[PDB]
Amino acid sequence: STDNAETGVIEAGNTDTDFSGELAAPGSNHTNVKFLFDRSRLLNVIKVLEKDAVFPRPFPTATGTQQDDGYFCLLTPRPTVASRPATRFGLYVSPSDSGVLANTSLDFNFYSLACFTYFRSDLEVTVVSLEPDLEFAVGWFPSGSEYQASSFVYDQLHVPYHFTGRTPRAFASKGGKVSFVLPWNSVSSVLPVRWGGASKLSSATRGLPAHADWGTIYAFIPRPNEKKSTAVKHVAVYIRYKNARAWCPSMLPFRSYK
Amino acid sequence: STDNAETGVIEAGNTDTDFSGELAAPGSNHTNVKFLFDRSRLLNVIKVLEKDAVFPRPFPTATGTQQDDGYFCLLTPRPTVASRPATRFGLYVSPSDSGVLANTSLDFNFYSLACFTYFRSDLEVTVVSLEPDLEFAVGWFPSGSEYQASSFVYDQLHVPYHFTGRTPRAFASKGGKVSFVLPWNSVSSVLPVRWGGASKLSSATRGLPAHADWGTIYAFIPRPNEKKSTAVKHVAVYIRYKNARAWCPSMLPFRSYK
Amino acid sequence: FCGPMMARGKFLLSYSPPNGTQPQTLSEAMQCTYSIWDIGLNSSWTFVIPYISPSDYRETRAITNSVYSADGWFSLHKLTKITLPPDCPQSPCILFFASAGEDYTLRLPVDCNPSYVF
Amino acid sequence: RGNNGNMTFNYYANTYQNSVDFSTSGILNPLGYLK
Amino acid sequence: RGNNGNMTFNYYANTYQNSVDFSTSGILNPLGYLK
Amino acid sequence: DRVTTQTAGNTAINTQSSLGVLCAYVEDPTKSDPPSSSTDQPTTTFTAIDRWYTGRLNSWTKAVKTFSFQAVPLPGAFLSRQGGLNGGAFTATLHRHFLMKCGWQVQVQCNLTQFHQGALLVAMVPETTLDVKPDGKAKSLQELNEEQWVEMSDDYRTGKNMPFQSLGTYYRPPNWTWGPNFINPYQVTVFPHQILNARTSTSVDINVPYIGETPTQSSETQNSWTLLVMVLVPLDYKEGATTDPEITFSVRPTSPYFNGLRNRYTT
Amino acid sequence: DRVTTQTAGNTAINTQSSLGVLCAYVEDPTKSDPPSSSTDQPTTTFTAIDRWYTGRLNSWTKAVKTFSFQAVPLPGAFLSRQGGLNGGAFTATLHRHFLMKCGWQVQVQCNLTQFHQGALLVAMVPETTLDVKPDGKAKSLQELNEEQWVEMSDDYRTGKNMPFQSLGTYYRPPNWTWGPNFINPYQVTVFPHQILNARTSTSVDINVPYIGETPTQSSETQNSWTLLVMVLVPLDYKEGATTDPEITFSVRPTSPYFNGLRNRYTT
Numbered sequence A, B: 001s002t003d004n005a006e007t008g009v010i011e012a013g014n015t016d017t018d019f020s021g022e023l024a025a026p027g028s029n030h031t032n033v034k035f036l037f038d039r040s041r042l043l044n045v046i047k048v049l050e051k052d053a054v055f056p057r058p059f060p061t062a063t064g065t066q067q068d069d070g071y072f073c074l075l076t077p078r079p080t081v082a083s084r085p086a087t088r089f090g091l092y093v094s095p096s097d098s099g100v101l102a103n104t105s106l107d108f109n110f111y112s113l114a115c116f117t118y119f120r121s122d123l124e125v126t127v128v129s130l131e132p133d134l135e136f137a138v139g140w141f142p143s144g145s146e147y148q149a150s151s152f153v154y155d156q157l158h159v160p161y162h163f164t165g166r167t168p169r170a171f172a173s174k175g176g177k178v179s180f181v182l183p184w185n186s187v188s189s190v191l192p193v194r195w196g197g198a199s200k201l202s203s204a205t206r207g208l209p210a211h212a213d214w215g216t217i218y219a220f221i222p223r224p225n226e227k228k229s230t231a232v233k234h235v236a237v238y239i240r241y242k243n244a245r246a247w248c249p250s251m252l253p254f255r256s257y258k
Numbered sequence C: 001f002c003g004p005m006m007a008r009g010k011f012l013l014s015y016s017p018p019n020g021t022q023p024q025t026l027s028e029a030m031q032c033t034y035s036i037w038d039i040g041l042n043s044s045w046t047f048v049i050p051y052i053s054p055s056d057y058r059e060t061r062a063i064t065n066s067v068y069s070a071d072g073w074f075s076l077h078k079l080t081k082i083t084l085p086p087d088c089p090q091s092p093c094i095l096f097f098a099s100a101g102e103d104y105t106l107r108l109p110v111d112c113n114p115s116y117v118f
Numbered sequence D, E: 001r002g003n004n005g006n007m008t009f010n011y012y013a014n015t016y017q018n019s020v021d022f023s024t025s026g027i028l029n030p031l032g033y034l035k
Numbered sequence F, G: 001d002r003v004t005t006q007t008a009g010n011t012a013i014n015t016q017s018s019l020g021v022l023c024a025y026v027e028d029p030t031k032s033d034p035p036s037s038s039t040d041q042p043t044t045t046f047t048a049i050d051r052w053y054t055g056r057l058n059s060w061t062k063a064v065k066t067f068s069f070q071a072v073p074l075p076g077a078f079l080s081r082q083g084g085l086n087g088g089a090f091t092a093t094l095h096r097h098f099l100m101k102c103g104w105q106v107q108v109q110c111n112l113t114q115f116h117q118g119a120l121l122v123a124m125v126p127e128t129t130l131d132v133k134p135d136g137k138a139k140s141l142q143e144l145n146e147e148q149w150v151e152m153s154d155d156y157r158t159g160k161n162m163p164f165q166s167l168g169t170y171y172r173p174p175n176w177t178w179g180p181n182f183i184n185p186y187q188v189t190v191f192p193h194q195i196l197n198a199r200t201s202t203s204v205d206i207n208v209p210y211i212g213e214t215p216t217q218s219s220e221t222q223n224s225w226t227l228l229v230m231v232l233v234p235l236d237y238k239e240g241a242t243t244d245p246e247i248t249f250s251v252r253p254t255s256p257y258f259n260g261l262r263n264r265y266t267t
Helices: F076-080 F185-190 G076-080 G185-190
Strands: A041-049 A072-074 A116-120 A123-129 A137-141 A151-154 A157-160 A178-182 A216-220 A234-240 A245-249 B041-049 B072-074 B116-120 B123-129 B137-141 B151-154 B157-160 B178-182 B216-220 B234-240 B245-249 C008-016 C036-038 C073-083 D032-034 F006-008 F011-013 F018-024 F053-057 F071-074 F097-100 F105-109 F117-124 F176-178 F193-197 F203-207 F225-236 F247-251 F258-261 G006-008 G011-013 G018-023 G053-057 G071-074 G097-100 G105-109 G117-124 G193-197 G203-207 G225-236 G247-251 G258-261
Touching: A041 A072, A123 A216, A137 A178, A151 B041, A157 B041, B041 B072, B123 B216, B137 B178, F018 F193, F071 F076, F105 F117, F105 F225, F117 F185, F117 F203, F185 F225, F193 F203, F225 F247, G018 G193, G071 G076, G105 G117, G105 G225, G117 G185, G117 G203, G185 G225, G193 G203, G225 G247
Parallel strands: A041 A216, B041 B216, F018 F203, G018 G203
Antiparallel strands: A041 A234, A072 A216, A116 A245, A123 A178, A123 A234, A137 A216, A151 A157, B041 B234, B072 B216, B116 B245, B123 B178, B123 B234, B137 B216, B151 B157, C008 C036, C008 C073, D032 F018, F006 F011, F053 F247, F071 F225, F097 F258, F105 F203, F105 F247, F117 F193, F117 F225, G006 G011, G053 G247, G071 G225, G097 G258, G105 G203, G105 G247, G117 G193, G117 G225
């Protein structure tokens, strides 16, 4: 019908508006935000700790720093790099062996439907092993805490300080999984899917939120540091957004035409 | 505002007292004593018995005494030495091999928040193994009992007397854990975090409470003494203070400045 | 003020919110949240630092990649010099305390630093 | 209510399961109002 | 009540679970009263 | 009818081709409670900042292609004086308060004759870093004059050129391919927008509320809205018509709340 | 009793030797209607100028004679920054408004020990040109440091040195002998005053209303009040006491009315 799209509001018509027709019956409510993000999906495949770690030092990290990379999973749909939140998402195309390949992550199923700016939800974290008969454990520390990185000698065995704490270290049975729901613990009222301000941090970068995360999990093996194995064991972190709310509609990513 | 701190009581003000402001809303009650100690933490890594033990003889223990050290876990946040309560906490810096290295313990998470003098609570004891596929058992004897140290020959097998008793010997399934809550069984009305009196015992030492404990656990393997293995197996004892009450505020430990 | 009873003086007590530069001049600290404390009969002053922060709960441990630190700076400026009569000790002593307000609230226990024992 | 078929029985309380907001003190409405 | 989310059902009785004291016969009060 | 004079303070603006004030997300975006993350009293609105701030913007030639945008950050244009847009006594208050919580009300004017064709897409685009070069630093006034109109390249469609952190010599620098502050140029009409067609209107009217991840954000470092004038249809005319029509805008903060007073911001 | 804390805005001041607030000419000099010589809306008080402005003042030595005054014009000390007296957001509003109509509330602090003697005469002296050299120009900050205390000479008692106009080469220049902005130093206690004796108080408290020949006066060129610290009894002490006690003052404008907004004053 006769309209003005320069107005900015176009009323959603039906077939009966211009023609002779009828309204179709409403099919289903699967587009509900609380329904559509309330399902699990893979976030990041992280290695499993076998000793007391060294958490990745903040950027710009110089060479020679003996730290432990690819062990901590900053639980965020936004793009991360080296277990710390980033802006751009980078994947290595031809990863030659000069320098440390930084473990990046992103929630591919989220941004293809993240047609909004702010998003708040609880987080159900399921940590599925990627190793036959792995008895692991899933430590965690909230948004705004740091990793306790040393070891205390119990009975001539370097038991690290990430076995205990006031934060949930769920121990898995052998051949089992770990699943627990994390509350919204960040200091921001919502998580910015898209952020345009500047974080007044270690040198300020536009478009990088400081506390848009549910925390950081890491997997360790419940043995002291003398019982260290040799081969590298991985674990996979699935994530479900319980009780999702979303505000302020925005864009969906640019699907190319080639 | 105008006050007198020599009085000894300073009334806790707000922003509205001197300035124009408002009261902030109360955040949470995580400083509640019954909430804050009601969470598990590691106490002591003890070896697992494989025969009928000899309980550590009281101090001063002379050389040549064939006894079994590092097997009994005197369940106390106060510093212990050789499974008996002590005053000072000692860790070996360079432990050379002259003499028996005494297994000391302390509750590191407790004293950093033990800003009180007397503390009474029930005790949930979880005894996590530190060995792959260990079928162990967790004996116990209350505050003021002693260990029954001999063996009775059943069917030409020296079954020790710590398999049976009137005190809870919980048997673990293989690959499993042992968890049970112990009541307040000491003869003192409360446990002194800090004690200043003298225990009229075997020669009296100031500052050492005699019955400030929930008992003493020990781990044994349910096989007779002919089925003794060779390697040393450890087990880790976690502890939770159920229904905690605390009296008489006191100091927190001196954080150094170096 | 743990000096002698015969001392008379004033002290300015400025809490600056986080600025790019720590205020040092008295005129740079007169503009912030201040209060003037006159030494007299009653000898204590409880400057209550406001809770000025965007987030509802501040982080209690700023061991992080650091800058000029939020949440700002307390600063004790002497406004007028302490005028002492003759035969009184020079350089008196302002004993500082640090309590919590009637609305100071804590959240989220973490594992403590066990470095008090080494 | 979300992707939740447990219409019958919630074991854990609402504060422990969810995370309610603290206090400060169908019909799909449009996201732009021409006035 | 502590760190206890079991608002619904206590299986064991109060004497077996906890340890009550035998008989002899919010508002945060201050720990020092100036009188 | 289509003659709406929007009086505000001591500065009123007229329009005789008014499509209507596109109020965003609510009926009245002026209604706004104080911030809940402050324990002091906010500096509310007063009659010397309750007024419009006209500032210019670069001309719209035939050389401009399709989707070539031109971003005006709010309040980021008051502070860098973007397009001659002196903030008056609003920037004199914005530099002296740490947190600021306001919702905007903009109006873009561009007078096309009935013989011109073209369609600007004016929209209040939330939370974007479009004023920032793909190299971190924000654009100065010279760089807004050296290009006059930012072309919608592939780096803006994929979000490849949003600012990053230097990972240092330790990590091998990854091949960055995507970042969430992209522009999908075909979906800018999800934002609170009006189309400035050359045959319906000469002034679009958008009224947005305060949105932001915190109940009030920092004053120097917020970009929660971004005025975004995008060319959907390029300008075309015959030789003789008025070449290069000028574009202006007029920004008015509705119901601000300034918290955290301090001295004037020194970097 | 004698402990009065005068809270105002975000700046409070204490005193423990308070004689009382000498309210001048009325019961409450804060009550003040708007100006009747303006047809616009005035900028009334707001919570960023409703506060005290402490600024220093030159020390009071034994070298100072009797009646040696030291004049602090109001609002003329906010604008020239006399004695480190930055006006804050009051001078940032005083430069941008043409007419200003406020009544002051001052407080002069000077802490004398019980072994000193002396008596300053603090008074709010209306309509005087004491900050101006006998040669027209106002005194800069260097000339207030080059003398530290203006001696009550015969030129100030007779008013001989108040500023004049150059009659030019035509008129024979007359022998000027008198001018009505004299100081009679013995009659300064007719003004709203308190005496800052070295044995009763350390802080005088004067609260004056707006007076002026027009219902509101110009902002740059008014001197309707003048703080005037005059030495009645010279300072004296024995060798060992605290030499040269400092003098400060604390000025707070009660109920201003700013009319006639314009840009920041360029000479």
